[PDB]
Amino acid sequence: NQYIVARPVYSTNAFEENHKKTGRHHKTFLDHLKVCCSCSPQKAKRIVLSLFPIASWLPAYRLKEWLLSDIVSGISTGIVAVLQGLAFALLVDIPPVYGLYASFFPAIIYLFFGTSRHISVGPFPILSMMVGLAVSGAVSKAVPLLDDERVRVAAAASVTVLSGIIQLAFGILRIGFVVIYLSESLISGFTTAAAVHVLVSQLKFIFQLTVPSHTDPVSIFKVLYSVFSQIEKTNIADLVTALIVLLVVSIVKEINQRFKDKLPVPIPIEFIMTVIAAGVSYGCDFKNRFKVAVVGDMNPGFQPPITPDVETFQNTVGDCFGIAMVAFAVAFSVASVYSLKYDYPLDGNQELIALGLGNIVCGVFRGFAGSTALSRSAVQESTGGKTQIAGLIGAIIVLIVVLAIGFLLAPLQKSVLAALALGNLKGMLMQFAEIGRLWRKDKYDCLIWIMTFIFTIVLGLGLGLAASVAFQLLTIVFRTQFPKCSTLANIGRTNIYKNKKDYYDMYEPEGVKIFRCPSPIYFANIGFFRRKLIDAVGFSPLRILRKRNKALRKIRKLQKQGLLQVTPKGFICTVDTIKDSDEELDNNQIEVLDQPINTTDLPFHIDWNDDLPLNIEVPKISLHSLILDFSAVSFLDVSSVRGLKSILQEFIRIKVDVYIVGTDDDFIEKLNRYEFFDGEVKSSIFFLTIHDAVLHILMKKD
Amino acid sequence: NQYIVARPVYSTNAFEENHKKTGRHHKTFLDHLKVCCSCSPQKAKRIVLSLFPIASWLPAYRLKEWLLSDIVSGISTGIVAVLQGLAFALLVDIPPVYGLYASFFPAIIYLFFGTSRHISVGPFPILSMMVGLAVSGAVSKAVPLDDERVRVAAAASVTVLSGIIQLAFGILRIGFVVIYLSESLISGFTTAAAVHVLVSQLKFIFQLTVPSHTDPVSIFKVLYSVFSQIEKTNIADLVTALIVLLVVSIVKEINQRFKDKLPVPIPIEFIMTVIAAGVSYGCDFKNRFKVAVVGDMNPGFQPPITPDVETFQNTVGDCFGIAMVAFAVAFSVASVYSLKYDYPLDGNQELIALGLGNIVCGVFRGFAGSTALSRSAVQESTGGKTQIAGLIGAIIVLIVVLAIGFLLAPLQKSVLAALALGNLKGMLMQFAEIGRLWRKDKYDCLIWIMTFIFTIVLGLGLGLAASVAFQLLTIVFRTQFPKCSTLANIGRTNIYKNKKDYYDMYEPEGVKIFRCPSPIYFANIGFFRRKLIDAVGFSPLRILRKRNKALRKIRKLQKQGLLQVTPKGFICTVDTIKDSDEELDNNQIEVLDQPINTTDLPFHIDWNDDLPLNIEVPKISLHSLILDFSAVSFLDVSSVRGLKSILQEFIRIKVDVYIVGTDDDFIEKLNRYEFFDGEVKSSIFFLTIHDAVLHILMKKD
Q1: 8 A C-beta contact, residue A627 and residue A694
Q2: Strands A512-516 and A625-629, bridge-based pairing
């Protein structure tokens, strides 16, 4: 088990010379733009098949293996989607039939343009809250009781159409990779804070209080105050009914997930609780007996198409962008959990296209934005969902409820809908345990979690997310801000070089320093790098050059005065103990000391580490070779190359050899584009490894 | 030359077990806290001296070598600072004597608390514009000579708040924020701000009346207001402004060319202003041509003022922006002289000194200002040795504020605008950085171009915040799609290079070496997974799922008795298997990702060999996967999770995974993530690629 090697020492250049390099063509932007306009027959066919996924998965349908499972799954998820749409239309502060429209239209569009097979398309609590806040802001900023709700419905439809336009545009430009800009901890903190938001927003329905339409910042607190400032007017029937429902659903949901095997299908508890609530509310006339708030009479049928208010568009651009980013992020996360679980490809740009088209059509037909709820997508999948025919059947049941049997949902209290929303909220509320976990594993991701939570609670849900994404990008700088730069040493008289402070019996070759920065070097850390390198070598190369240039100036002054003589032997001092007189260079003359020392005029070389005559004193250095382990240095920006070029020039002007090792070919190619190399700084400073550079130095010195 | 090495094959664990690792106690935050509160006698002396730097440099003043120089640089700079203060008070839209106040108080405070020895402290055009925009916004957002009074009051409160912010940042020791602004961000921001200032001086060259426009797009609103009324331009002012701008430009270049030959820079600003003031007074331009003049200034200082909290509330964000810019600019100018003259520079003390100076200035009715490069270059180029030149400049400003200010009464505002425009060449010619950055680095060209657009459209304050955010986003752009590669041995030695870059390369059979040349985190973890799967040629989870399907079918036959188990092979008594798949339900399909435990069966199943009864499983050739993590600087929670998941699916399909090239700190952090367990172990870490390859070869032989 021996590592035995016997090869020649290699500079990066000697390796390129000895081993001829496979010539590869340039992947030019112009020829790439040439493939863009392919106009090929099969290319156009695959483009059209990628824009219309139903044309590819519907003919490949397995009837005897999928049909009945999709029927059952669709029945269940549609019965869940009706109630979720009503509750989320409560969250948006519009009549509850618009939640039915939001549960109908996007599902029917995603049936045609969607690439997923397991998500339930429709509204979810976080997006209904965001849409309601955007609508309150729009009605606030609009230039001058049913009229108020009509204005809110129009503003919701317009916010939805603009969100869908933004999503469809992001999918057309093929930017479906923006979901990578939200980490797991950012999403965790955001969804926990948003679950708290949705909890607080359902309190005006549990207690049945009149809360104004607060806007951000701090709307959760404005809302908490409004609720508890009047906690004396709380309806007791509403609170009791909401409590009992929450208790039952919670227990059964547990029973459901605890006993998944014994149950052929999960127990529909939201449906059963809704039927029982409506029955005991209609039979006992709770509306009159206990003055409870009910869903009321809904208009049977759909609304005519609406035209989006450009005024609302102007007043809600930022909100609509946020509604679009959160919608895509949530839908893509869920969709990705089932693509992976069931092993089929999920196009992100087609996700954006389908969701944008669905939101556009929904908003045109008086709906509000929605992409997918993790709780409803779970029901469809757990009930046997195989394709998006389950989504079609859920939309058919929502249609049946809209057109035919909506009057049954008339005596249903809104406290029951709020209680269902809270029962679904517990799952996101249980994410508070991630704080301690991240604290132990990565404090930067713990910081992302805590700061996302605080930004989302204090600021809005839309400004909170934007602020949260920015801080998460800042933590990437925090990581690579103060790298643990170290000095290496050989260990084992072999080619292993490790931290000089870590092991015993290590060995530093006389005059050689090996410095390692374990991070990419850019604008935020080039100064820290230069300072740690100066601490490692033990001196400042520039200070040395200036002092040598000053000394050399004094030498030339004393020698052209005749006070000392130049000889191939060296400096001959007929006069000793010279008068000390600093030149005291002025501001416009002082720059001369940073110039390379050109003593070629002198007959003999000057050993700057030896004794200079006539009381001249310069700091002496033992360093004659500096190796820079650039192996873990990923990239270098323009600020870093400038700083690096400067550092290297200074070491070279004080006659210290510099070596960069451990780098890959792409790294060196990029440096050539920065105009880094020149007469003083050459490509010969690059060596394959540390041992290569060290051996090259030992042979030079010996 | 010969690289000759003979050592054992080392896994990271083995190397550590054969080499005594110095036991080093890490410094916990708790301890850091203690040394922090040491209260050592010598410690206190250091702190107080650090906060009052004058107690160190003044006692060491070389009189014979610095006094005359300091005097000359002081009189010259002070003469420049008077005019710059008047002009920048025009930029704030307040009476101009307040510019004199702004040029007197921060210099005097920085003389005591400052660490720079060359920077001139006072207002500069970009900060005066930022302060002006803030006050216009504050006056608009206020629940109800007067206009002048209201503007002056707002300029003082914005200054006090930005100074307080500066003082706060210096006390909390956050003086390293200047690293969050790159060279290209600063370049684009400063040339965009030079365009802003160019546009702002147009109402003074032409002598037009332009409203107090606010951002966004205030530069365009101003341009419209100006050229819409362009026909009302006062020709005398324009000719004057053009004459003053032309002459100064030529003389300045002469000063930069015949620099060393010249004993002292030629003071064109003073000479021109004196001639301009003279000819305007003698010929009575105010009446003869109705030119706009500086006018009479009350000959003294104003009484102290209490800052307005309403203004504070209404301008907090603007003050934050003003504070960062003043510090970023002052530190940058100071740094050039600290590196040029080799003295240390403390940013925290700068923020404190710049904070205190601004507070005293806003308290005494001035507006915010750190330093102007032009005035500092004037201070350093004229022999400025210590901050005594700043003291003498402030003394000249004092003299102008109390006795001779009346001489600056007949001076036109077009002359002040022409000087402020002449000081714009350096920042305006930074448009040449676009082509350079295009050649070198297109991410930095993107940073520059975007900062310029944001600054022009959103304004100086908001343009900078969006610019810093985009600057941070480019870091993600650079590492989002790393060029991952497959490596191969070239030379039959320990050199492993890109497989597609050379000829005669060798890949050990069954072995794959994969390199991701960047840190792996949330933004690129999915890309790493996709590229690893494209490189190995298959999805390990799919192979595991099909193996689990095949094993389920094999067991189904075994239970039936059709397939009889024998320690030699999979003998089948009946070869009449009918096509049938289990078709697992949604709640049962996850059993296919579990580890394969065939201990029940007597004989091992070669999943890469043919199975009984025509069971088809994709056969893989990979047995060893090496991951070259040398260029992987850090991981985050998202990536460690993705990595763990990847390694588990390769281990479950019997592919040994090796991670090579990592330092000891990398394996230490990974331990904190709970990455290692029964399946994924630390024995997967080796020292280098060649160590892993030799281990693989001996294992396989």
Answers
A1: yes
A2: parallel
* Interacting residues of B551 by C-beta distance below 8 A, sequence separation 6+: B596, B598, B605
From the list A680, A600, A684, the residue with the least C-alpha distance to A647 is: A680
CB B378 within 8 A of CB B76: yes
User: Can you tell me the distance from the alpha carbon of B156 to that of B695, in angstroms, rounded to the nearest whole number?
Assistant: 73
Q: Which secondary structure element, helix H or strand E, spans residue A4, and what is its range?
A: strand A2-7
**Degrees to nearest 5, angle at CA B467 with B463 and B471:** 180
Structure-solving method: cryo-EM
Q: Which of A442, A531, A640, A676 to mutate to test the interface with B (most CBs of B within 10 A)?
A: A442
A183/B341 CB distance under 8 A: no
Return d(Cα B448, Cα B464) in angstroms, integer. Answer: 12
Closest partner CB to A22 (pick from B6, B502, B586): B502
Name the residue in chain A with its Cα closest to that of B337.
Answer: A587
**Cβ atoms of B120 and B77 closer than 8 Å:** yes
Q: Does B63 touch chain A (CB under 8 A)?
A: no
- Other Cβ atoms closer than 10 A to B507: 14
Domain ranges of chain A: 56-475, 486-539+621-701
Q: Could you tell me if B400 and B130 are in contact, meaning their C-beta atoms sit under 8 angstroms apart?
A: no
Decide if A591 touches B, using CB distance below 8 A.
yes
Task: Assess contact for A368 and A156: CB atoms under 8 A.
Answer: yes
CA distance A319 to chain B (A): 18
Tell me the three state secondary structure of residue B667: helix
Q: Measured between CA atoms, how close is A524 to chain B, in angstroms?
A: 5
Topology (CATH level 3) of domain B485-538+621-700: Transcription Regulator spoIIAA (3.30.750)
Looking at the DSSP bridge assignments, the partners of residue B656 are B624
Distance between CA atoms of residues B197 and B216, nearest Å: 15
The answer to whether the Cα torsion of A351, A357, A363, A366 is positive or negative is: negative
Report the C-alpha gap between A676 and A645 in whole angstroms.
7
For B502, the closest of A8, A19, A522 (CB atoms) is A19
Q: How many CB pairs under 8 A join A and B?
A: 276
Question: A1 and B9: CB-CB below 8 Å?
Answer: yes
Residue with tokens 């700190």: B665
For residue A479, how many C-alpha atoms fall within 13 Å in the half-sphere facing its CB? 28
Q: At what angle do helices A125-141 and A414-429 cross, to 10 degrees?
A: 120
Q: Which of B461, B463, B351, B357 is nearest to B130 (CA)?
A: B461
Joined tokens for residue B198: 């160019």
Which residues of chain B does A183 touch, with a Cβ-Cβ cutoff of 8 Å? Answer: 521-523, 636-638
In contact, A12 and A688? CB cutoff 8 Å: yes
| DSSP-derived 3-state class of residue A180 | helix
Contacts of B313 by beta carbon, 8 Å cutoff, 6+ apart: none
Residues A20, B503: C-beta atoms closer than 8 Å: yes
d(CA B185, CA B449): 9
Give the whole-angstrom CA distance, residue A520 versus residue A634.
5
* Measured distance CA(A523)–CA(A638) in Å, rounded: 8
Helix (H) or strand (E) holding A15: helix A12-18
A7, B493: Cβ pair inside 8 Å? Answer: yes
| Closest residue by Cα to residue B130 from B100, B185, B95, B93 | B93
DSSP class of residue B8?
Answer: E
State the Cα–Cα distance between residues A683 and A659, nearest whole angstrom: 10
**Which of A499, A516, A639 lies closest to B182 in CB terms?**
A639
Fold designation for A486-539+621-701 = Transcription Regulator spoIIAA (3.30.750)
Any A CB within 8 A of B340 CB: yes
Of A385, A665, A691, nearest to B498 by CB-CB distance is: A665
- Polymer length in residues for chain A: 702
* Two structure tokens written together for A16: 């390129």
